[PDB]
Design a protein around this nucleic acid. Structure first.
Ligand SMILES: Nc1ncnc2c1ncn2[C@H]1C[C@H](O)[C@@H](COP(=O)(O)OP(=O)(O)OP(=O)(O)O)O1
Ligand SMILES: [Ca+2]
Ligand SMILES: [K+]
Length: 430
DNA sequence: ATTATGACGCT
DNA sequence: AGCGTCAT
């Protein structure tokens, strides 16, 4: 009752760029705008691998991980943009720089947590309090929420998509109690107004469109964001959670899309997030551990306490390349040449990072995969990163991995290497 | 023969 | 530390 937490203390948003690498390429090349198109890396093997897909192309069934030759079977008129190649490898700099454009705009509105190259969480609790004080108790017009969906509405006693959106928004706003400054539903609504403003600023200042979720925590904001894509935002209220979760597959919730989520389903014999409410906290802890159990107990009730971390910059800067099938590295010279290519890209990015962000990496992590190994990484070793110098880093990387070579001939490398990875970590202020 | 990333948990 | 999981 009066002592039961409801997890309604914060307003959190998640902003997710729509088909991000495609938009970056469509901004640059207007011929690609409003077309079925995709972004591909490399071209020689089966036309290249697709890593991003426009919504026009998704209508034809084109997906990530598809080979472009195969995507062309579904969509013969599919347009393609290729990821830049430098030093023999895909180079993602254009997309990282475009990401910074968006993250810097978002940071004007609130503290952000960079979740990925094109996603950021926003803690809007303070901004909402501020806006509410401005508002001086005046109601919120639907005109302030032109791209907002209210999840679960309309409900109760037109056949167009936008019509339904407005119907739900009207029901929501009709019900709002705008004279209570501490009403969680009102706070979420003001949060959604701010996110409309944020999303308009992003589009105005970069050309890029995005979707967003607004709720009381990160998991719900993330879930909300995906409900109405692209170019829309969705408010998931605390009250919407029981119905929403009642048919929500467990794997849809962030962190439950893999083995843990499969185990929840198998061990408990349930399918939907809402079904978790029927277990005690101790029961859940008994199967999934103390941390996961407590997290699941609260999460299935719409409650999560994970903070929006004040972090706008990546914590690591890495460079990696696969060498699949026949291209696996089988000589010493090969391994050393590619470590150098990786180190040269890493040095370039590190030097830029040091100038931009007043920090220096102090640890170099070297990872490799050996042919035959099922795991993405076979071996990981660290050494000191004391100078931003590509020849030094590549020499150091070789040193920490060179005894992995089983070959009695040290000219040759065996078993052949199917992946190389250099990662700079442990930043200190500079 | 997806590939190139990146954060965080466990022991 | 080195490995594993989960995610864009
Ligand atoms: N598995 C991957 N491999 C390489 N790059 C990826 C992968 N997943 C995502 N990316 C890149 C390309 C994406 O444009 C970008 C953002 O990813 P993501 O948000 O999952 O999809 P998206 O932005 O392309 O479409 P959506 O509109 O569905 O969000 O990150
Ligand atoms: Ca996205
Ligand atoms: K994303």
């Amino acid at each position: 009752g009066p002592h039961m937490a409801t997890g309604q203390d914060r307003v959190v948003a998640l902003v997710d760029m729509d088909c991000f690498f495609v938009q970056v390429e469509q901004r640059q090349n207007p011929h690609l705008r409003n077309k079925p198109c995709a972004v591909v890396q490399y071209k020689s093997w089966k036309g290249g691998g697709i890593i991003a897909v426009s919504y026009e192309a998704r209508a034809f069934g084109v997906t990530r991980s598809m080979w472009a030759d195969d995507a062309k079977k579904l969509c013969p008129d599919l347009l393609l943009a290729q990821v830049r190649e430098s030093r023999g490898k895909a180079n993602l700099t254009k997309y990282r720089e475009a990401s910074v454009e968006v993250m810097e705009i978002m940071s004007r509105f609130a503290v952000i947590e960079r979740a990925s190259i094109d996603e950021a969480y926003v803690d809007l609790t303070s901004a909402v309090q501020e806006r509410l004080q401005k508002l001086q108790g005046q109601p919120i017009s639907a005109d302030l929420l032109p791209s907002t969906y209210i999840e679960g509405l309309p409900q109760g006693p037109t056949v167009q998509k936008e019509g339904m959106r407005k119907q739900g928004l009207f029901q929501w706003l009709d019900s709002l109690q705008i004279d209570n400054l501490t009403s969680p539903d009102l706070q979420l609504t003001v949060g959604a107004v701010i996110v409309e403003e944020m999303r308009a600023a992003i589009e105005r200042e970069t050309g890029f469109q995005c979707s967003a979720g607004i709720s009381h925590n990160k998991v719900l904001a993330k879930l909300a964001c995906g409900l109405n894509k692209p170019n829309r935002q969705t408010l998931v209220s605390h009250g919407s959670v029981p119905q929403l979760f009642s048919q929500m597959p467990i794997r849809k919730i962030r962190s439950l899309g893999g083995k843990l989520g499969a185990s929840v389903i198998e061990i408990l014999g349930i399918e939907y997030m809402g079904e978790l409410t029927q277990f005690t906290e101790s029961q859940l802890q008994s199967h999934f551990g103390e941390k996961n159990g407590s997290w699941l107990y609260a999460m299935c009730r719409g409650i999560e306490h994970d903070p929006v971390k004040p972090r706008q910059l990546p914590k690591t800067i890495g460079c990696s390349k696969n060498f699949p099938g026949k291209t696996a590295l089988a000589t010493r010279e090969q391994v050393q040449w590619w470590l150098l290519q990786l180190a040269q890209e890493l040095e370039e990015r590190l030097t830029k990072d040091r100038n931009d962000n007043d920090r220096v990496a102090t640890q170099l992590v070297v990872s490799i995969r050996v042919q035959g190994d099922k795991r993405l990484s076979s071996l990981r070793r660290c050494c000191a990163l004391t100078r931003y110098d590509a020849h030094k880093m590549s020499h150091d990387a070789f040193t920490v991995i060179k005894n992995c070579n089983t070959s009695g001939i040290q000219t040759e490398w065996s078993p052949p290497l199917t992946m190389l990875f250099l990662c700079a970590t442990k930043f200190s202020a500079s």
